[model samples]
Target: HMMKFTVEREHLLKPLQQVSGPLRPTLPILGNLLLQVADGTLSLTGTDLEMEMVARVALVQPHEPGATTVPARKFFDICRGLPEGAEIAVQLEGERMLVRSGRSRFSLSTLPAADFPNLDDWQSEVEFTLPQATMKRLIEATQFSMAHQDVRYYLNGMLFETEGEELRTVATDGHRLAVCSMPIGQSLPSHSVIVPRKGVIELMRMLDGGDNPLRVQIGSNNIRAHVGDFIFTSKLVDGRFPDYRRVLPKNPDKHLEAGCDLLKQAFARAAILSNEKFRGVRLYVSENQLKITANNPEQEEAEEILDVTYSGAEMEIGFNVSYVLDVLNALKCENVRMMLTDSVSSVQIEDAASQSAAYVVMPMRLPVCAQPLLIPLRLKVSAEEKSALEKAQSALAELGIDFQSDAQHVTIRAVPLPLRQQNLQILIPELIGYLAKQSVFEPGNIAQWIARNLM
Candidate 1:
């Protein structure tokens, strides 16, 4: 196909940079970008199937407009390093593309534009307009908490949830969880979607912190965002994200407020002496005072004490120092509140002045504790229920756990976390024990276990 276009060097370079990741060495065509000049507009499409980015650039002239592919990096670099006031003229020959500037000429290989894979089948399932700056802020507040490489595939992304009047974003990597929300000012349908890790990350880079409106389309297997001059498309994670509401502590009554900067500083210092592997730090809460302590294998110890308006019972919990610091830095708020129900339950971190964002961090298991949380489960099996009983027995047998059983009934006690109103004394521990016994549990599986067994 014959194609010709002339454009200023800088005008072409910006769009190229936005689609940089399109090139990969494994596939010859993957290292190229599709350039299409049509209807007096010039557009560039780049894709790796998983992520596709398209950007349009203003062309000075489009003569004999058509489509072709050329090496992206080479094309971008040449334009960027060209002499000032140089006009870039690109045209297609029999099989190769020619690039020309004043007294400078170069020939490059080409691929058929028809063979270049692009995302064109996406149809808007649920579309809405949101301010670009608002989406950027939502991603920044929680994207850091997404899991990098985890067995739980869904944890590798962020969740966007829409309720009647609010939209929220949540992310978790097992040790820490972050959530942020704002009112949308209208009654809308409920929708929750899991956006893949790479998509969330690249979207953040593509978004501008401006008030300009962006149209977003969410579908069964894809998500598309239309920026001013760019269209970003990414595949959605196929699995469902866990329900985060169950992970939050219920009616936590004990809490303390402290300066955000001061608490961050304390965590930074304590982390210095914390174990490199565990990164664990102990938080000691007493009346009107907070103490952070850490010790390494070398016996080096660190401790920081800060003043706080405390209204919680005296207790201590272990946490990864980095997780606490992440929430603090993300907030960028003046004061932070730490709330908890007990040392065994999760700790909630929030902005002392606002509830727009909240964070939950599960406590690390320490050798010393009041009582090991236990959950008791009893299963009854008749001759016809052999399949269900066999499944439970097999898993327990693999973990070498012993239980009292009869021809008709089997009972097991699993162990951590406590509660009341519901025979929780033996519930949480059983879930934990069942999960831990199989040697196949991710950080967020605690929530999954509760959903499967409790329900």
Candidate 2:
């Protein structure tokens, strides 16, 4: 059946933005979006088939009514860059639709709505609604802790836990755990759902909360959040979330609160003097005193201490300065308090004014002599800097001059064998001893070390 409808291009990006996951070459219905037309309205839905989101819009002109799920991204991309003040004409002609503007025609390839994999509309046992503003705040407070490519697969994303009138979102990259909470207007049953890694990232980007109310409905297998005209959905992770309660220690004996902005800047500046990798920071918390010491693998160290106020005992602990600084940067609070009970326990981060925002970061335990790996840097070593060696053979027989070449320059070649090829790293003479012992004598070793240190 053929159908014609017209809607402003501005509001049509909902389903368009949500389908980025399935667009990957894997999964069924990777490029499909469900199109349902009824009651003089049009609804567009897309999914990786596991977790699907639907975007709806009212049409100014409705010729007829029908339903079908087409390729969400394909259709969106075809209309994405259209002119600013243009209202698009959506006409379904046969199997594909031709999108027409002032002087262009885009014939989009679309799967029939029937051909698209059908998804069950989850009858969520637990559901609640909250101000979109509240939801947005929670995400902002904790998204930075999300893990990528971790052995603890579940740690690869975030956990969304809700109870009664409170919503909690927690994320960790194994090294640290960040948590944010907010109280809502409605009371709901308790629930815990670990959102998949990619979905959480996408959800963070598509923060649908604002002045409008965002209705969050939770199912046994999915979490559906409807923000404005578009609905966001994600599959609940099937793994066990670490008993995070077990991770945070009790009230620390030493607690110091001070200007968060100043502390943050101090940490960032000290971090620069710290080594490039495994930048361990030894913090000393005493009554009215705070001290920090950092060192890299190159026998260089950075130490600084500040005066603060505390009535409890003094304590010292080691942490990745960058991790501490990253949390400080994310909180963006004017004042904060660092709570520590002892040296080994996870450090607590709390907003001096708001009890709702707090985080716990576990300190990384680096071996005393382990080669230092600081931060990973993405430096395209201008092929000119990295040297490629060329050998001159057959001294007297082949070339008379023998071309005793010892000049240096960089060379880069496409990876011929991705998985099986052995890679060698090289670095300046300063790191020669460390590389020689590890049998990483090659210069490329530095590049590999740099990337791993970021993790």
Candidate 3:
């Protein structure tokens, strides 16, 4: 049997566009959109196994109830190209779908609706309703921090957690983290789920910020949302998100406040001269002023100074300018507050007027513009020991550490900044032990001898 229906293009186009599935799907049926007509309603659905979207529109006149799948891209294109308010007459004939609108017509290939995959059914552990505006704000505030195609799997999504009467969204890509929370108006069971990156983005696009309430359901393996005439479902990421609270700086010692727009402009200007690869910018904070400086390999430099509200001791720190800009852009607040501990520690940022959202950006190691630290060693050893020393130097060189050795002299050309800052007595002994193992020497003897002579 075949189904026939006529729908106004104005009413059908938006939903059709919204439910179109992926362009390149693994299965032919997965690329098609499922169409079901019944009870004066036409429902369109698209899915790529991991996530699914459905949109429903009321049919003006009742028609024979039937279901079929058609090439989503072709169907949407035909509907979109039709004149506004044009009545689109669609019919299923055997293996093809006929679309007639105005003087244009299209015969699109069809697939069996039964072959279209549906997400597995799961019982909802928690169900609640939230204003669409709050949901949109929650996502926009933190979604930028979500990881993309990251191997950590879990970090490649946004964590939605319900605790007390608040709904929280958290996203992190290892280097930086963003978190936002809003009151849900009702207490609910503590639940957490990770919505995949694609799903989060698609859902954000679908949400129109308004006071209209949207129903949300959370299960152990899935999350589903119903808003207006659309239903969105996504498979829950099966890994655990890092405990974001643990990463948030606690009671940072230094605080600086500045106009969000002013800081954003300053960072943007300095970023132009930042290293193409590192994009590092140095921030020097003094009594009531902040200075931003950046320089690239070409020796081009940018510097900006802005008045800020800061009374902490003078301090300097380096960070990826892009990270800071992201936080500022997302905040959209008049004034931004930055909390810092030191140059090496991460900084926390939030709106000065509200604490509903927080962002933490890790510091970048600034390029050290000084001579490398060199250590020289003179060793008295037998022939076999001499061979071991040579082998040790070769192994160290392979590890990117420059170790130069002559007959009885070994000179470590450079200790990386990170290692040089460490306690040399402890670090030198560990390095000697590692070299001893690599060279088949007595680890204890070599380590002890190096500690005594080096320290």
Clashes of each: 8, 25, 0
Best by lDDT: 3
- Residue 251's lDDT in candidate 1: 77
Name the runs in model 1 displaced over 4 angstroms.
Answer: 22-26, 367-455
Tens-digit lDDT track of model 2 for 1-455: 57667677776665566555444356445666677777777777766755666667777665467765566666777668887777777777777776777787777656667777656666887777777678778887878777767655677767888877789988866456788889886687888888887676666565644677777778888888777676778777777666566556566666789788877777776787786745667777777777877776776777677767676776666677777888888778888988776654567888888878778865443301112111111123322222222211221112111112223422221111110011212222212223333521333444355345422
Question: What C-alpha lDDT do the candidate models reach, one value each?
Answer: 0.75, 0.63, 0.80
Q: How far is candidate 3 from the true structure (C-alpha RMSD, Å)?
A: 9.6
Choose 2 or 3, whichever is better by lDDT.
Answer: 3
Which digits, one per residue and each the tens of the lDDT, describe model 3 over residues 1-455?
Answer: 48778888889988987887333358888888999988888999998889999999898854667899998888888788877778999898889988888788788888888888877789999999998989999999999998777766888999999999999999987667899999989999999999998889878877878667899999999999998999999998988687878678756999999999999999999999998876889999999999999999999999999999999999988888988999999999999999998775668999999999999986654522211231222234445545655766544443334555667645554443344423333454456545545535443544354446544
**Would you give me the overall lDDT of model 1?**
0.75
Would you list the clashing residue pairs of candidate 1? Answer: 374-426, 375-426, 375-427, 376-426, 414-429, 414-430, 415-429, 416-429
Q: Per-residue lDDT of 1-455 in model 1, one digit per residue for the tens? A: 68898888867777888877544276788888889988777899877778888998766575668999888889888888898778999999978999998878989999999899867686666777888877887888899888877766788888988877777898977556788888766666677888888888778877777677888888877888888788888888867565667567777899999999999999999999999976879988999899999999999999999998796679888887888888999999999998888766778889999988889886755611222212224555455343343445444333323345577765543222222112432443454346435434333544455556754
Off by over 4 Å in 2: 13-15, 18-24, 27-29, 68-71, 364-455
